[PDB]
């Protein structure tokens, strides 16, 4: 009953029951809406704040791990570069070792050639020796 | 006119104007609060949404960059491993070549020994052949 607030007993009693009831309900309804709008909004406000607080933590986490990762890239690039030069040096040693092997295999190949040709020369002397020796026997 | 919604034309005309004015003031005021509360919520929500969409973008951007860093980090970390194996493989190759060359020097040392020994035999055959040749001429 909000009507006794606005009007006076004399004025209010001059209103038919239907008129008061129509009025009472309408005031109640708009009053219900006021409490309704406040309830809805307040619950919304809580939701908005809670969601902002949580997406903030998600950013905090996203920021820190990007940071920890960025340093790690740098860590690799440094290590990458050091061993990259270390590899070149080893490659240099390897290529020098190959040329030595190539020189030695070539040397050995030549030394076999000289051996074989010497054996050929040696054989010629052997058969020549036989012929002289045998021919000598005729005159003994 | 907030009063007209509630009552019909006949009803309203049996009311003294003062009664209507008092009713109007109360009705207007409650309606003013309603429109006021809705204005509040609607402006609040817009602010709430804009604050979210802006921090949402900062999370989105930070994530996309975190992705690019992870991808770039992994790309490097694998390469680190890759050339790390190249060192191991090459270090083994070098160790194999060093062992091979050392074996070859020994081989060459041997071949020279075999060579000199061949030249020795060859000289002997030369002297022997000369000796037989002379001996033949003596007896012919």
UniProtKB/Swiss-Prot annotation, chains A, B:
Which parts of this chain are annotated as the region Necessary for interaction with HSF1? 12-115
Q: Which domain of life is it from?
A: Eukaryota
Where in the body, by tissue, does this protein show up? Expressed in esophagus, ovary, liver, skin, smooth muscles, cerebrum and fetal cerebellum (at protein level). Highest in testis, lung, thymus, spleen and brain, lower levels in heart, liver and kidney.
PTM per Swiss-Prot/TrEMBL: Phosphorylated. Phosphorylation occurs on serine and threonine residues (comprised in the C-terminal region) by MAPK1/ERK2 and stabilizes the interaction between these two proteins. Proteolytically degraded after poliovirus (PV) infection; degradation is restricted to its unfolded C-terminal tail domain whereas its coiled-coil domain containing NCP- and NUP153-binding domains withstand degradation.
Q: Spell out the subcellular localization from the entry.
A: Nucleus; Nucleus membrane; Nucleus envelope; Nucleus, Nuclear pore complex
Region of interest called Sufficient for interaction with TPR, as start-end residue ranges on this chain:
1-11
Spell out the family assignment given in the record's similarity comment: Belongs to the TPR family.
User: What role does this protein play?
Assistant: Component of the nuclear pore complex (NPC), a complex required for the trafficking across the nuclear envelope. Functions as a scaffolding element in the nuclear phase of the NPC essential for normal nucleocytoplasmic transport of proteins and mRNAs, plays a role in the establishment of nuclear-peripheral chromatin compartmentalization in interphase, and in the mitotic spindle checkpoint signaling during mitosis.
Q: How does it assemble?
A: Interacts with IFI204 (via C-terminal region). Interacts with IFI203. Homodimer. Part of the nuclear pore complex (NPC). Associates with the XPO1/CRM1-mediated nuclear export complex, the Importin alpha/Importin beta receptor and the dynein 1 complex. Interacts (via C-terminal domain) with the KPNB1; the interaction occurs in a RanGTP-dependent manner. Interacts (via C-terminal regionand phosphorylated form) with MAPK1/ERK2 (via phosphorylated form); the interaction requires dimerization of MAPK1/ERK2 and increases following EGF stimulation.
Tell me the domain comment: The N-terminal domain mediates intranuclear attachment to the nuclear pore complex. The C-terminal domain mediates its nuclear import.
- Disease named in the record: A chromosomal aberration involving TPR has been found in papillary thyroid carcinomas (PTCs). Intrachromosomal rearrangement that links the 5'-end of the TPR gene to the protein kinase domain of NTRK1 forms the fusion protein TRK-T1. TRK-T1 is a 55 kDa protein reacting with antibodies against the carboxy terminus of the NTRK1 protein. Involved in tumorigenic rearrangements with the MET.
Record-given protein name: Nucleoprotein TPR
Species annotation? Homo sapiens
Q: Which residues of the full protein are shown?
A: 3 to 142 of 2363
């Amino acid at each position: 009953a909000v009507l006794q607030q606005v009007l006076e007993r004399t004025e209010l009693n001059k209103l038919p029951k239907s008129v008061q009831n129509k009025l009472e309900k309408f005031l109640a309804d708009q009053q219900s809406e006021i409490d309704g709008l406040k309830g809805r909004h307040e619950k919304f406000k809580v939701e908005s704040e809670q969601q902002y607080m949580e997406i903030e933590k998600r950013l905090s986490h996203s920021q820190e791990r990007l940071v920890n990762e960025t340093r790690e890239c740098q860590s690799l690039r440094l290590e990458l570069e050091k061993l990259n030069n270390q590899l070149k040096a080893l490659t240099e040693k390897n290529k020098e070792l190959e040329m030595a092997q190539d020189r030695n295999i070539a040397i050995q190949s030549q030394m076999t050639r000289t051996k074989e040709e010497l054996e050929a020369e040696k054989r010629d002397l052997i058969r020549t020796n036989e012929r002289l020796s045998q021919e000598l026997e005729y005159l003994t």
